Amino acid sequence: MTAAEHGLHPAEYPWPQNGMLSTFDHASLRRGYQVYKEVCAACHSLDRIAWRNLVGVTHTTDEAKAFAEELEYDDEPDDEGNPRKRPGKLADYIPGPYPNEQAARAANQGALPPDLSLIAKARHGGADYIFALLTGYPDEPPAGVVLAPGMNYNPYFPGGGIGMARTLFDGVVEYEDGTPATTSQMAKDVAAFLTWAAEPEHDERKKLGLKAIIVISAMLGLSVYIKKFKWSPIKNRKFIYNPP
Amino acid sequence: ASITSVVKTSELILKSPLLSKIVVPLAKTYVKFSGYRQLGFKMNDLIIEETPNMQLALRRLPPTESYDRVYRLIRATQFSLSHKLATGNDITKPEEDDHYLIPYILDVEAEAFEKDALDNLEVV
Amino acid sequence: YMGWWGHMGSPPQKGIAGYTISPFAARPFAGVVHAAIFNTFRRTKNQALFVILPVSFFYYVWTQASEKNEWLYTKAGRHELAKAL
Amino acid sequence: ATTFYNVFVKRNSAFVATILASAFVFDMTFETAIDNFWDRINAGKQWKDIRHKY
Amino acid sequence: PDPAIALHEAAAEGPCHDFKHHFDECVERVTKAQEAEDYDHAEYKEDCVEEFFHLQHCINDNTADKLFRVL
Amino acid sequence: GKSTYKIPDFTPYLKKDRNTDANRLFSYFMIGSFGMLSAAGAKATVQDFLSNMSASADVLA
Amino acid sequence: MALRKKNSLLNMANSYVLDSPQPSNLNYFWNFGSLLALCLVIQLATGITLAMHYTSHASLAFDSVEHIMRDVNFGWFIRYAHANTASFFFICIYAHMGRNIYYGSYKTPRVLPWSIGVIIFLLLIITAFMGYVLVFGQMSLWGATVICNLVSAIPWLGEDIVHFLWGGFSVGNPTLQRFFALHYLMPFVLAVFALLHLIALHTAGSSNPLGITSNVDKLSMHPYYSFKDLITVFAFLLMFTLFVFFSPDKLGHPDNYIPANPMVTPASIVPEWYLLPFYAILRAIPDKLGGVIAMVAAILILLILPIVDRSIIRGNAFKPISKLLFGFFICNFLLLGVLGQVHIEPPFIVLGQICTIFYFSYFLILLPMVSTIENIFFYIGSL
Amino acid sequence: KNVIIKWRGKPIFIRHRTSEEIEEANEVNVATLRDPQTDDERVQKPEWLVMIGVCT
């Protein structure tokens, strides 16, 4: 295949979470949620994430309850069996922008924006691919590229023509912690947030892995001592042969 | 493959002057690189023995040859498990690498193959 | 072809005296540094060709094949690709 | 060494009781130690470090 | 403004200058070829994606670490 | 080479203090440490693993 | 008489794990058998636990796996343990089979454990293939489609057999629910065959790296091989830990995190890595039925090693030419693996065919020739 | 116009071809066709091109 058919391979960026002992930066996760909510959520769902999931990761219980309570969700029917709505609770999932695929495609010139809950695991490259893609729209497509109608040139996307236009521009978001919201900063934060959404066990997993590595290494060392100890009579055995 | 086969083919080669001139030097290097002598084995110690014919040949070894074979197998096993090689008198010298077993297995197989032939005789 | 303890199927053994010492009496790591350096070097040196020759050959074959494949799918390799298909 | 052997090692019942009691201690202390070390190498990054702003 | 803009410009003019010039020359050729008539009825229409990839790969190698250091 | 009463040389391996309680105690310390980490590792493994059967996060919600 | 010998139940365990007489010189490659037993135990424990949380219906399958990852306590670990141990199972089985081929474990009197072993390997492949479908991501669906359509090559009835396997006209809910039931069953069948190959082996005992009888010098399985097995168990657990906790998706395909979509076809449909050599062999033959036969033959041809090896000596420790040929055979098998996942493009098409010829010619030509010549060199060289 | 019907997971292209479209198709000499077939072999009704809409 042509390199264009593959897509350009994203750089390896130094994420805070790269590193056997490193967690996510939770301040970046919180800022990334705000980019999701103000930019991506217009077209993209995050259906695998419930409000309770944010609690103690990016937000306090009260902040997350407030986000849930602002929305309306379908309740059980009333006593005459007529439909009713209720305010959201922490158990509810974050609601998506479109009712079905057909509506989603109609709003995006035929393209279907994927759900972003697993996107960091569902693409080669992970956070680096998301960062590279969002920051990698050239002002002008390389001379000679013919884009299909409704397509935008992005070299990281296989084939080059993506149905999603550039969306991150300096100052589309105003971060609540005073961080300058440059294109690069917003892409970094939202890529971190999406990585967390794909693998929310990440921080716990790597700490448990450190404990396992330590115990297993010690047990490996002791098992070598014990094997050598038990085998030494066989290893040390000597013979004197006197032919009968 | 039967020991009979191996021995007969070898004898065809040793007969042909040309063939022996090219095969005998190769065979000698092969044996040197094989390295079984560095564990104190003789070539015949390596022959597969878990067959009726070989079990019969080993039972026909003279007692002294049999006791010496047992010692070489035990000694080589101890070198193997220790990851050491033989040194000194434990290394098999080329003059000690005698075919002590070949005559016994050739007699066992001779009878076995004659029995197969004679089981298929047709009175003419 | 295998018996059990007491009748394992060994030819009769005679004339071998075997000796050994208790695991508590021995140093389990006696001669470890010599083994780790010199014994491993000897064992590795004697087997190196059997690994190096096939690995180096098949790595070279792969390298040539992958570089040609890459070149055929560039602009420069247009014509050679057209013939290859 | 004789005393220690005689009390904790000679009887297998005592040896196993000592091993299990040690495993209990190890488990509790190792947990606390790793928790602190993990918090130091990932300082300022975890929710517990930013929670005070909210 | 976006730190990447400056870093990318600097890397193109500096360590990635050979690739920058290759891409530039490619663009010139392709644009001129598009200008010429009976281009639409040509068998092979050249693009500059290859050269672009070589340049971007180079810029990214010289910038990735620098950029994340200032975010 | 011939006499079986002349024990082969074991001096490269023999410990001088082989009959002491200190000598045995060291080897049992290694065995004991191994048993201790295996007990703590088994306990951790079993606890974390079996917890899958306790109410999941969506059920608790 | 000791109870472990007197009581018939205890005595069976005793015969296999305690008094079992072993050669005193088994090297570390004799440790893969106990690693494979460990993988089987991990896959049973993790697999039965996943079955308590997984839903086999196509509308819920992929989401039940996400529920395992997200909501079930330690579900991420049980899922990653199960998925990674499937790869480790194949690394250990290839090592164990490679040990067996290098040391002549297939020769008399061990033809029966080897032949049952070849069936174990076929059952492992089927088990792993069905388990991969259960996720119901894109690779799950499209891999099932392409692999199950190979059965269409069977003449006359092939198409009918495929529809029967699927339970419909394409891979869908009926297929997923049946693969769940069979994926749960097949590991139990595999454990029985694993036990059968050990009982068959017990008549000769283990072979050993020198290839000679060990009836002269036996060691009890316990404590010697018990404690030597612990070393490789802890080495395995360290490798397990590095993948499961630090890189849980390194051996996987990102497309399996996209839900199955019968409309969109993935860019490349490849099997899991451990099936790749067999896929390269299939591509090498242009005919559909030809390719399927070659691919099956590549596994069944292991059954003729007892015949085509003409050596009077068991194993390769003392055979320099056989060791070189074995080295080339193994590296060729790894190259076939790599070629199984490249695109069908020049020059890999021809390379795959040459590697396929080399694979088969090892069994049919080279090993019979080399083993014949080495017999003569041992005889003449030691005269 | 051309429709896309799912049938056994595979997409089905259904095109309602005009008179002049049918004509256009019946022109190409069968000789010069990787897969040599005329429209009459393909359709049972000239106004209904029904195909399995996956690229070969």
Ligand code: HEC
């Ligand atoms: C108003 C529309 C729109 C907005 C705003 C939007 N996207 Fe998208 N996005 C799309 C569409 C449409 C696609 C599908 C593109 C295609 O497949 O051709 C897409 C695709 C993607 C993909 C997958 C590309 C691939 O490899 O398949 C990622 C990742 C992505 N978007 C992330 C984001 C992030 C992160 C944001 C904002 C912070 C964002 N999107 C904002 C419309 C949008």
Ligand code: HEM
């Ligand atoms: C030899 C034993 C086994 C092997 C090699 C094996 C292999 C696999 C593989 C490759 C997968 C795909 C994993 C993934 O990528 O997500 C899988 C999934 C699964 N297996 Fe197994 N398995 C085995 C035993 C078992 C057993 C005994 C069960 C008992 C039910 C089981 C239940 C499952 C379940 C429920 C899934 C789907 C959920 C998931 O993907 O994790 N497996 N298996």
Ligand code: HEM
């Ligand atoms: C679930 C898979 C398997 C398990 C648990 C398993 C287990 C074992 C064990 C424990 C042994 C004795 C110890 C050892 O030599 O390592 C052994 C020996 C053997 N296995 Fe396997 N095995 C499996 C698969 C296979 C396969 C696929 C083959 C062959 C293709 C095979 C062929 C053999 C042979 C020939 C021996 C005897 C080797 C010898 O000691 O010389 N096994 N197996």
Ligand SMILES: CCCCCCCCCCCCO[C@@H]1O[C@H](CO)[C@@H](O[C@H]2O[C@H](CO)[C@@H](O)[C@H](O)[C@H]2O)[C@H](O)[C@H]1O
């Ligand atoms: C015969 C065996 C006896 C019965 C076995 C008992 C089965 C279940 C017992 C406890 C399982 C849950 O017990 C609970 O486990 C998890 C670890 O798994 C612990 O949880 C601890 O570690 C985990 C990760 O390791 C973190 O997510 C958590 O924040 C922390 O508190 C709880 O502190 C403990 O209360």
Ligand SMILES: CCCCCCCCCCCCO[C@@H]1O[C@H](CO)[C@@H](O[C@H]2O[C@H](CO)[C@@H](O)[C@H](O)[C@H]2O)[C@H](O)[C@H]1O
């Ligand atoms: C591997 C896990 C441990 C569980 C054991 C595996 C289950 C398989 C056991 C059933 C198969 C029957 O297994 C068979 O048992 C008898 C006694 O038990 C063994 O018999 C062997 O040991 C006994 C004493 O230990 C002797 O009387 C006998 O001469 C000897 O051959 C066979 O060599 C073995 O093949």
